[PDB]
């Protein structure tokens, strides 16, 4: 039993997204395809079920209207259409199959992420972060770098073309309204900066962007 799901989409606000899920190799059984939304990290919300053989759907009363479940019996292809997408609906959506008796989701698809955003490809602004701020802790200097207002993801950041790889902490991006923002920090010994060069490297392939910010003193 294998389930293939259509991968990521970027939907506009007040729009709809149709999502597919093909079941394979558990031919002849009466089993159901299930859709489960995972809001962010830990809340799983059961959306509904549909039998590809008979057509028996059943929704969670919270999603009826937001979500329309359909199947092409003839292909074993379930569908979920979500309409009037709001920023709030930006989650991962799983497809999984159950098989009689027990009633557990025993086989799961890989997930479908939907980012609901009104942005077109937006290039980031890369800002050096020099710790002038609150003077060195003695032995260590921590430097940062801030990547602001980019759509879609990802950007990639490395320090000194990845020659600097220890004491780097890169923070997950967050959809700052309808754009993303992420940062990273590197901790070097106090003799190193600025006697040695530390440079923030960024490339946002979705917009041809590559930038190098030497964090000048």
């Amino acid at each position: 039993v294998q389930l293939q799901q259509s991968g990521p989409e970027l939907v506009k606000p007040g729009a709809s997204v149709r999502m597919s899920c093909k079941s394979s190799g558990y031919i002849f059984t009466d089993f159901y395809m299930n859709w489960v939304r995972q809001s962010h990290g830990k809340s799983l919300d059961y959306i509904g079920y549909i039998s590809p053989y008979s057509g028996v759907t059943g929704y969670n009363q919270k999603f009826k209207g937001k979500a329309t479940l359909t199947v092409d019996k003839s292909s074993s292809t379930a569908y979920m259409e979500l309409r009037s997408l709001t920023s709030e609906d930006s989650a991962v959506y799983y497809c999984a199959g159950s098989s009689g008796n027990k009633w557990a989701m025993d086989y799961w698809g890989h997930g479908a992420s939907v980012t609901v955003s009104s942005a077109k490809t937006t290039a980031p602004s890369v800002y050096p972060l020099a710790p002038v701020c609150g003077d060195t802790t003695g032995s260590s200097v921590t430097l940062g770098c801030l990547v602001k207002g980019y759509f879609p993801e990802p950007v990639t950041l490395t320090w000194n073309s990845g020659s600097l790889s220890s004491g780097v902490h890169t923070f997950p991006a967050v959809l700052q309204s309808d754009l993303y923002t992420l940062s990273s920090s590197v901790t070097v010994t106090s003799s190193t900066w600025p006697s040695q060069s530390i440079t923030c490297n960024v490339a946002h392939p979705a917009s041809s962007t590559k930038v190098d910010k030497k964090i000048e003193p």
């Binding site: 050096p128 972060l129 002038v132």
Partner: peptide, 22 residues
């Protein structure tokens, strides 16, 4: 570690003060 906005950003017209609690 707290970080003052960068020249660049203040030239942009905006100001982020960042704080890493590593």
């Amino acid at each position: 570690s707290i970080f003052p906005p960068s020249s660049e950003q203040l030239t942009s017209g905006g100001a982020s003060v960042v704080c890493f609690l590593n």
